[PDB]
Amino acid sequence: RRDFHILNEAEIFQLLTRETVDSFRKGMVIPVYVRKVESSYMSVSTQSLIAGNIQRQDILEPNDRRDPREVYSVGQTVRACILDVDYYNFKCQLSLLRQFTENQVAGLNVNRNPKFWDIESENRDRQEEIDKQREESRESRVIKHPFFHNMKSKEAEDYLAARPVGDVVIRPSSKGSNHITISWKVAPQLYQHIDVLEENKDDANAI
Amino acid sequence: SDGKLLSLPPVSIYSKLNLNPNQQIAIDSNGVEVKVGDTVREFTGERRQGTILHVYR
Amino acid sequence: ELTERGKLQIEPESPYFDFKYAKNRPISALTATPDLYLRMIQAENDGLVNIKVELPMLSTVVDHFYNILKSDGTSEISEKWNALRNDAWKQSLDKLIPLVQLNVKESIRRDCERVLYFQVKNSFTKKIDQAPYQPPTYAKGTIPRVLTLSFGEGNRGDAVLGVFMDDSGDVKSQIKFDEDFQSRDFSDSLTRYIKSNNINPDIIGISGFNIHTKKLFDKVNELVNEERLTIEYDNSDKHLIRVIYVNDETARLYQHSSKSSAEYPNRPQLAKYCIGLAKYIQSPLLEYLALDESMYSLHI
Amino acid sequence: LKHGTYEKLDEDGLIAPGVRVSGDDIIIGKTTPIPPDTEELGQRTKYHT
RNA sequence: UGUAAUCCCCUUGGCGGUU
Known part of the structure; x- marks a missing residue:
């Protein structure tokens, strides 16, 4: 048999942190835990007890001029991106810049060659799911007013048809819950719909 | 974590993964911290919802 | 192909995402990567995906067999006969295709399974192929006297346990260090235990469950480098006693096995873990044998 | 221990x-x-007696 | 980075307070 096998840096790291070198390397986003906040750096801890630090250039955005302590405090965990890993010393440096924490989405290295990958199908499914995300729900509006009636434009005109000239009805507007359509009889078989824009609304159903 | 089911004797299992709240931390898509027992809803897919039982990676 | 279940369940993080939209993958290259085909089959069995085998030149074979079968007549009667023959031939192809697809699928499945079986065999052999640690100035195969030190976790309230075993494989003495491992008292007590009691271990093993064990390893290495704790050689550059990390799957499984409890009814679990580490250093093969059924659950 | 404070006790x-x-x-x-x-088992004398 | 704690009898007896 071969002599006793001595663990190396990668094997020791995997044994201690129970995290593989592949799953913990450059270009990965992990929810680290803030442990100490300082003006020039922030000391954070990962899930696997790996102590990390970030130099002041990356805790806050380059455009912002605030203080690290005001924005982030102890116990406020944030997402971070791995920049460097000291496997021997179990030390890592992180970045809070959104160019890493947000843009890194397709982190897999799957070969997307059109000859062997159906890019068109994945794209089509992508707009399908994005349109599904765009899909929402809407409901009717209820208003309490003596001259308010939940009628269509033609319905309001027909309701005012049986009434003499000058009678007024109020119905929801098609421009949104912040708009109100008022229909009044200008003349026999002649009606005017006037849109009213609402400001400082307390509620969608409120006036 | 993969989504499969296994059957093993109690001896074969390594040990329970005792994790403190300083270790069992979850962050949602928007970046807001979510703790144990909170209710979240899947952003896409089946869009299901439920209470968090355990957080790992 | 993807079913609706496949359309919804194959996520960018799921292992099935590697072949969510694969197309025209060569069969001959599959045998070199058996796990991809195995995972495709597993996803198919889950009702998510559908695997299809197709030939670019299927029309060529159909036309060639038709030309062999078709008649050379040109009359309208011959045209009707040729049409009937071609339609029956197309129906025969429709019936025949699924069976051939299934046969080819089974053949590739068997090939990939055999390849992965051989790969797992080689991985296990590599895992279990290691002779016991050879102390210096001794021939290969000699069983060394070993000392294991461990504390497990390193939280406030984590004493360091020490277990020493001789070359005979029988426990000789177990000691507790109840002071802080960073104190001078810890180092002095460890030095006294190492030297005064004539223990003279050939190699010292250190292991744990987290990164806190690294500091203990560094402290022990510094102590060894400072006190010049050279190995006693039976009757001159005396060599230092080596301190290394120890793989502990077998130790972790041994600390929970009832075999240790029957063997050591009045000992702590950490003592059993240290004994398992020491026995693994003395003889990895026997420790791997001791797993019995739990060896199949190892990450091979 | 009681939820009160023990800091007012002498030696x-x-x-x-x-x-x-x-x-x-x-x-x-x-x-x-x-x-x-x-x-x-592994407590550094910090066990409740 | 060293990180702080959650729990209480029962049965009798007497003496009282407000009516």
Whole structure:
């Protein structure tokens, strides 16, 4: 048999942190835990007890001029991106810049060659799911007013048809819950719909 | 974590993964911290919802 | 192909995402990567995906067999006969295709399974192929006297346990260090235990469950480098006693096995873990044998 | 332990005269022995007796 | 980075307070 096998840096790291070198390397986003906040750096801890630090250039955005302590405090965990890993010393440096924490989405290295990958199908499914995300729900509006009636434009005109000239009805507007359509009889078989824009609304159903 | 089911004797299992709240931390898509027992809803897919039982990676 | 279940369940993080939209993958290259085909089959069995085998030149074979079968007549009667023959031939192809697809699928499945079986065999052999640690100035195969030190976790309230075993494989003495491992008292007590009691271990093993064990390893290495704790050689550059990390799957499984409890009814679990580490250093093969059924659950 | 504060006790477990006390403060510190558990496994003397 | 604690009898007896 071969002599006793001595663990190396990668094997020791995997044994201690129970995290593989592949799953913990450059270009990965992990929810680290803030442990100490300082003006020039922030000391954070990962899930696997790996102590990390970030130099002041990356805790806050380059455009912002605030203080690290005001924005982030102890116990406020944030997402971070791995920049460097000291496997021997179990030390890592992180970045809070959104160019890493947000843009890194397709982190897999799957070969997307059109000859062997159906890019068109994945794209089509992508707009399908994005349109599904765009899909929402809407409901009717209820208003309490003596001259308010939940009628269509033609319905309001027909309701005012049986009434003499000058009678007024109020119905929801098609421009949104912040708009109100008022229909009044200008003349026999002649009606005017006037849109009213609402400001400082307390509620969608409120006036 | 993969989504499969296994059957093993109690001896074969390594040990329970005792994790403190300083270790069992979850962050949602928007970046807001979510703790144990909170209710979240899947952003896409089946869009299901439920209470968090355990957080790992 | 993807079913609706496949359309919804194959996520960018799921292992099935590697072949969510694969197309025209060569069969001959599959045998070199058996796990991809195995995972495709597993996803198919889950009702998510559908695997299809197709030939670019299927029309060529159909036309060639038709030309062999078709008649050379040109009359309208011959045209009707040729049409009937071609339609029956197309129906025969429709019936025949699924069976051939299934046969080819089974053949590739068997090939990939055999390849992965051989790969797992080689991985296990590599895992279990290691002779016991050879102390210096001794021939290969000699069983060394070993000392294991461990504390497990390193939280406030984590004493360091020490277990020493001789070359005979029988426990000789177990000691507790109840002071802080960073104190001078810890180092002095460890030095006294190492030297005064004539223990003279050939190699010292250190292991744990987290990164806190690294500091203990560094402290022990510094102590060894400072006190010049050279190995006693039976009757001159005396060599230092080596301190290394120890793989502990077998130790972790041994600390929970009832075999240790029957063997050591009045000992702590950490003592059993240290004994398992020491026995693994003395003889990895026997420790791997001791797993019995739990060896199949190892990450091979 | 009681939820009060033990910081007003002296070395002998008795408070000293002249000390202002409030509700739920501990004025007499007393302990009763308990058979130790298996915590001697890996506890550095920090086990409840 | 060293991180702080959650629990209380029961039965009798007497003496009282408000009617």
